[PDB]
Amino acid sequence: FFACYLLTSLSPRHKGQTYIGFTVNPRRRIRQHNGEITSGAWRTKKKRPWEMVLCIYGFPTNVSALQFEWAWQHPRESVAVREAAAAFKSFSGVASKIKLVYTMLNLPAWNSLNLTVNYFSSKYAHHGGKSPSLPLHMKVQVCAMEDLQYFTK
Ligand SMILES: [Ca+2]
């Protein structure tokens, strides 16, 4: 199981700030960012509580997921993403990070992969409706953390 994920902060001092990362265990990872586990969350610990908005999984290797993570975090450096990124009005906030990742899922670098977009709450799924449609073999679902965890094993 190799995933990239998106958080958003519910801290009033950082409200709406996002975090993008790579993980093999989303439940462990959100617990780390929120301090329920005391590892893995230097700096992000200060912006609690975080919500995990979504993750994308199905990458065939850790390396394939890490290539996607790096481009999502650095769309202006990525060869694959930069032309699409040159047309974006904003890179800030959940709405922009989701529009960007749906754009990425349509690029040749990733659009042949058998990927799933997992929203952890219906709260965020409408952003996908305002983003470019995904390649038709990809899956979009709303699945809470407690249910997806069994599929990560
Ligand atoms: Ca690692």
Numbering used by the authors: 27 to 179
Sentences from the paper on this structure:
Here, we elucidated the crystal structure of the At-HIGLE nuclease domain from Arabidopsis thaliana, establishing it as a member of the SLX1-lineage of the GIY-YIG superfamily with structural changes in DNA interacting regions.
At-HIGLE1–183 crystallized in P212121 space group with one molecule in the asymmetric unit. Crystals diffracted to a resolution of 1.7 Å. The structure exhibits a mixed α/β topology. At-HIGLE1–183 comprises of a β sheet formed by five β strands oriented as β2–β1–β3–β4–β5 with β2 and β3 strands present in anti-parallel orientations with respect to β1, β4 and β5 strands. At-HIGLE1–183 superimposes with the nuclease domain of Cg-SLX1 with a root-mean square deviation (r.m.s.d.) of 0.8 Å. In summary, At-HIGLE exists in a conformation ready for interactions with DNA substrate. Catalytically essential amino acid residues are Glu95, Arg55, Tyr31 and Tyr45.
